Each structure stands twice: as structure tokens, then as C-alpha cells.
Amino acid sequence: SHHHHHHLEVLFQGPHMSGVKVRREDAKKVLELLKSVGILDGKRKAIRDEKYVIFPVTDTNIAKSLGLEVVDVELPMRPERQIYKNLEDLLPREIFKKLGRLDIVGDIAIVSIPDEILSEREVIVSAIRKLYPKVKVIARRGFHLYRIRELEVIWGENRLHTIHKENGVLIKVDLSKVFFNPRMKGERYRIAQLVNDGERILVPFAGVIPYPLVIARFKNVEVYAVEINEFAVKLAEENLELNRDRLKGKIKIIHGDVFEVLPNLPNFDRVVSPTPKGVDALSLTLSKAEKFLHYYDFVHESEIERFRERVLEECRRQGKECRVSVRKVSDYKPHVYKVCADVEILS
Ligand SMILES: Nc1ncnc2c1ncn2[C@@H]1O[C@H](CSCC[C@H](N)C(=O)O)[C@@H](O)[C@H]1O
Numbered sequence: 001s002h003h004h005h006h007h008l009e010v011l012f013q014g015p016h017m018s019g020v021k022v023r024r025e026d027a028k029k030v031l032e033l034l035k036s037v038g039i040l041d042g043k044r045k046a047i048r049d050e051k052y053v054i055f056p057v058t059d060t061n062i063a064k065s066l067g068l069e070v071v072d073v074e075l076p077m078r079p080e081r082q083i084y085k086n087l088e089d090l091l092p093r094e095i096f097k098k099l100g101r102l103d104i105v106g107d108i109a110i111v112s113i114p115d116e117i118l119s120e121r122e123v124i125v126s127a128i129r130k131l132y133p134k135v136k137v138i139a140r141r142g143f144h145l146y147r148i149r150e151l152e153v154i155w156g157e158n159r160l161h162t163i164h165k166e167n168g169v170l171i172k173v174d175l176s177k178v179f180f181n182p183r184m185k186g187e188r189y190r191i192a193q194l195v196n197d198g199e200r201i202l203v204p205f206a207g208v209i210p211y212p213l214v215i216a217r218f219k220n221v222e223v224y225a226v227e228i229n230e231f232a233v234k235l236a237e238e239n240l241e242l243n244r245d246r247l248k249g250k251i252k253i254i255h256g257d258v259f260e261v262l263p264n265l266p267n268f269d270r271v272v273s274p275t276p277k278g279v280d281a282l283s284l285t286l287s288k289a290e291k292f293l294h295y296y297d298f299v300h301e302s303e304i305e306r307f308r309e310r311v312l313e314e315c316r317r318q319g320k321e322c323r324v325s326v327r328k329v330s331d332y333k334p335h336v337y338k339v340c341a342d343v344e345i346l347s
Helices: 024-037 060-065 115-131 182-194 210-218 230-246 258-264 282-287 304-317
Strands: 018-023 052-056 069-072 103-105 108-111 137-141 151-156 161-166 169-174 200-204 222-227 250-255 268-273 289-300 321-333 336-346
Touching (some): 018 060, 024 052, 200 210, 200 258, 210 222, 222 258, 258 282
Antiparallel strands (some): 137 151, 289 336
């Protein structure tokens, strides 16, 4: 006897050699159609020219029954090995160049996407997933009293809490409720290395206490942390307990308003002020410092001189003899820097 045709039809051992040719204008619609129908060939790459896109397909008879122009073409094989290093390696420059910076916090990727390229959301997500296989959440960043970033989940688990690893500590965060910038890992380590055992240190605006955690992880010191957001305070308490067996130093968490709390504290060897953008806490934080102040601010590159001058002015106003050094910590916007004034109080 013989076989049923609908059993034989799947035996062909060779590869798929055809694709459909569509106007770029119709490319998205057609990609969706081909996926829906089930004949999109994952084994090969699509290509494009000035006016046309060619998608690889698995069944040219079904393609024709979709009204599509079938062509015979040698399309590239899908890559088996990936050597992507940057997001730019995975996107058209016209898309990539419009993206804000990409941050990884725990297993969450955060990216800024202007409305203007929101139509490219799917390839953007694809690119990020490829570059970061382990991330489970991709969120779109808006803008930052508690300085929470506006965030919308655009791929993955519908959550914004995670645990981030940095400088030998564990930091629980919930990005829907608290501020956290992973890019400050350098600064936090830097200050931790400058600190000497036996210091008493004050960190106003402490968030989920990443600065105190890193400092205390490396130095036997006492750190006071002041934070007004009760969600951040809660997470800070949990972070203290989560890291307790690896800290050399001690941390005291105070829930309160810096501008109410600090006038009622004793003074400290060192003050570290990760100031909220736009807020001026220089007088108050310097007033709590006996030997060092590390005061963060955001300054236009044409105003740096004036910034240094104002810091020295406030030093004189408080009767302190100081040397002031201003460092560019990071590029914030074009022509605008996150800076740190390192103030050494002389005796
Ligand atoms: N008056 C005030 N008193 C105490 N904390 C304040 C405050 N105004 C703003 N904040 C807190 O200041 C923080 C600034 S963000 C810096 C967070 C943390 N130091 C870090 O390095 O990630 C936010 O957590 C915000 O809730």
C-alpha cells in the first residue's frame, strides 16, 4: 500500500528557500499576519532595501493564499552565536540615538523612550532582552518630594521591586516607591574608601541606605541616616537586617525631615549629602560637619566656578577654614553635570 499525502507532506529534509516581498509601509502588518498564520521562518533573517522588506516563510502556498508576493531569495541564517556588546549593536542608529541611558537594577531594566520612537517599542524591548537575557522586567522611564521616577512596565513581570547587588552588599529596592541610582556605585565605594575607622558619619537624604551600607561594609564606623519617605525607611530597615552579618560598621536609621532633624543632632566627623536635585542643603549639612563634607549638586558647566565660590562663601559664613574641591561626578544632561564638593575643614 501507500501513505496518506497529509503524512508525506512533512518529510522534506531541505531548508526553506523563499520569502514574501512587501512594501516597507506594510511590513509591520505583514509580520503580524505571518506570525498569526504560523508560517514565519525563525531560521532566517528578514532583509530590507529602500522600498521593500522580505520576510522568510515556511509555506509559500499559504503565503499566496494570503495575497502575498512570493520570491526566491537567499536570506541570511539567524545568528547562533551572539557577540553583541552594546544596545547600539542591536538597533538602528536613528532609534538608538534617541533612547535615554539604560540602567540595570537587580533583574529590572529601565530605559527612557520618547513618544517619538514609542512606535519602535517592540524592537527596543527585543534588543534589551537580547543584550540582557537575565532581566525579567523592562520599564519605561519618565521623570522623578520623594523623587520617585515615573515608571511603566513595558515587558515582563508586573513588578518594580528587586534586590540589587553592589560593592559587596544587598540592596532591596521598590522603584515604584523609592529613588535608587545604580550608577552611583563608584561614588559610594569611593567615599567608603576615604572613610577612617572610628568616624561618626551623617547621611541626610539616605533613601534605602545604599551609602551607609557600603561605607559600613568597609569601615568600622557609626552612620546616622535620615530619610523622610516611610517606604524607603521600611526598605532601609530590611536592608540593615539583610546585610547585618556582613557590616563592620553600625547604622542608625531615622525617619524624618532632614531640615527638622539635623538642627537637633550633635555634629559629625563626616557628612555625605546625596542632595535631591534642585534642593539647597549646603548650609545645614556643612553645619553638621567637623572634618569633611561631601555635598552633591547639579550644576551647568558654565556655573561650576560660581558653585565653588558659593561653597567657600558658606564656609566663611560659618567661621570655618576650608579647602574646597569640586569633582564632576557624571554627565546629567548636555552641558549639565552632577558634581560633588569635597570640603575639608581645617583645624
Ligand atoms: N526633607 C527631607 N528629609 C529627608 N529625606 C528627604 C527630604 N527630601 C527628600 N528626601 C529623600 O532624599 C532622597 C534623595 S535620593 C538619594 C537616595 C540615596 N541617598 C541614594 O544614594 O540612593 C530620597 O530618598 C527622598 O525621599
